[PDB]
Amino acid sequence: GDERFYAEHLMPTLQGLLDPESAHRLAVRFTSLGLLPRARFQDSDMLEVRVLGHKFRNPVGIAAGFDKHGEAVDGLYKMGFGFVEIGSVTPKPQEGNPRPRVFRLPEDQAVINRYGFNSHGLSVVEHRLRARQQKQAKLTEDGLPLGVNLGKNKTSVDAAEDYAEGVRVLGPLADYLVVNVSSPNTAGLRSLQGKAELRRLLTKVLQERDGLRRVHRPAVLVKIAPDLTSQDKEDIASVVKELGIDGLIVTNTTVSRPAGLQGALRSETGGLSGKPLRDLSTQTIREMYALTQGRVPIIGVGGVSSGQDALEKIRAGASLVQLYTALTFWGPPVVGKVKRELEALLKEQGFGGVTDAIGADHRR
Numbered sequence: 001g002d003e004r005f006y007a008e009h010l011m012p013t014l015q016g017l018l019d020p021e022s023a024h025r026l027a028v029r030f031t032s033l034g035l036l037p038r039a040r041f042q043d044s045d046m047l048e049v050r051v052l053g054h055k056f057r058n059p060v061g062i063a064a065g066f067d068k069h070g071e072a073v074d075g076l077y078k079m080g081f082g083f084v085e086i087g088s089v090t091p092k093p094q095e096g097n098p099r100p101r102v103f104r105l106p107e108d109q110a111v112i113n114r115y116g117f118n119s120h121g122l123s124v125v126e127h128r129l130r131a132r133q134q135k136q137a138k139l140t141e142d143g144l145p146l147g148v149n150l151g152k153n154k155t156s157v158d159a160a161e162d163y164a165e166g167v168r169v170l171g172p173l174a175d176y177l178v179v180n181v182s183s184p185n186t187a188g189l190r191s192l193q194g195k196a197e198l199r200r201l202l203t204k205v206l207q208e209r210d211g212l213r214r215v216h217r218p219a220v221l222v223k224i225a226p227d228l229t230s231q232d233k234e235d236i237a238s239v240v241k242e243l244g245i246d247g248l249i250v251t252n253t254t255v256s257r258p259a260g261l262q263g264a265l266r267s268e269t270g271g272l273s274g275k276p277l278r279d280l281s282t283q284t285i286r287e288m289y290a291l292t293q294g295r296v297p298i299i300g301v302g303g304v305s306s307g308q309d310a311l312e313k314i315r316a317g318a319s320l321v322q323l324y325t326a327l328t329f330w331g332p333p334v335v336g337k338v339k340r341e342l343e344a345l346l347k348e349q350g351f352g353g354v355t356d357a358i359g360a361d362h363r364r
């Protein structure tokens, strides 16, 4: 499946015919049925990473939001992702915001979304993952782990209890869990990144996680915004260390609108993803790595659409990367593209593998 054909004919046509939410629903459907380009790239040993208690056959994952309800996991591995993250999942089903709630900014290679945690809920996702639980166990053992990203319901009183319920229900079924406190589309949610709120929330999450039988006990990561103050970042790093949080996902979408955006839809409310987020996210990785002394694994995400973009985040401190918005524009071939370019650049820059490149900018 040609990189050129998808980039220059297929994705532009689908974009010309369908609004972005319809296009995404069709993509989830096709992916869930395995109707994808092959994909030929075979992962070399230079791309394997060991982190979070697992082997990852390659460091390129699908970011949360694409497969919100765990419907397409196997088709995402078939696409060539080293790991798959589903969600965000909320405790109770909820519809999210009214449509339209997602917008393309093609001149910016960006998207703005305001889905507001549309979710089938924990029970539905639980059963969906349970139907393939041993298939995933084998995938995980073969180097293809599964992450589950947890959110909170719009009308929930007690946010921490929403996250605890998620840990209890889906934790067993996940190699890692993500406490998503950085959606910009749920009122008040990002205030959970504040020191006191985060410590209270994560103490409860970790207690529930530690209460799970050893074989079912996932790593716990916290996904953070790209819009944090210095004080916020220092506070997060402190809490992450005080509690022994397994890792950080850096970053969610931005509420900022960087100067220079050209898309007609630039002033729509929501989080902005894609190329204009890229270096903001990279910078946030760099800072969090330094504040955590390189001892806390980071999954780097925001604006990755090439091997260079991947390597930049790796060298800034990410152990793994994810992408979401690049797919919208370039389609499935972009996965093998990132990986082939990443391997080439690692060789060019004198790294024996991804592992050797993690945090390399900090040792220069």
Ligand SMILES: Cc1cc2nc3c(=O)[nH]c(=O)nc-3n(C[C@H](O)[C@H](O)[C@H](O)COP(=O)(O)O)c2cc1C
Pocket (backbone or CB within 6 Å): 063, 064, 065, 066, 068, 087, 088, 102, 111, 113, 115, 117, 149, 180, 223, 251, 252, 253, 273, 274, 275, 277, 301, 302, 303, 304, 322, 323, 324, 325, 326
């Ligand atoms: C349409 C859309 C929906 C998303 N929904 C979620 C979500 O449910 N949970 C989450 O943690 N992040 C979500 N994200 C954020 C992505 O996981 C990722 O952090 C962000 O888009 C940056 O990566 P990208 O520039 O490669 O898209 C969403 C992103 C987009 C574009």
Ligand SMILES: COC(=O)/C(C#N)=C1\SCC(=O)N1c1ccc(-c2ccc(OC)cc2)cc1F
Pocket (backbone or CB within 6 Å): 014, 023, 026, 027, 028, 030, 031, 035, 036, 037, 062, 066, 323, 324, 325, 327, 328, 331, 332
């Ligand atoms: C008419 O629609 C199609 O032919 C589509 C679609 N959609 C086809 S034909 C063969 C094929 O790979 N697709 C296809 C295109 C995009 C995507 C896709 C788009 C966005 C994604 O976000 C991460 C992930 C996958 C998935 C697909 F499975």
Ligand SMILES: O=C(O)c1cc(=O)[nH]c(=O)[nH]1
Pocket (backbone or CB within 6 Å): 065, 088, 113, 114, 115, 116, 117, 118, 180, 182, 183, 184, 185, 252, 253, 271, 272
């Ligand atoms: O609106 C959502 O559901 C969603 C959007 C997004 O950009 N990030 C997130 O965590 N949730």
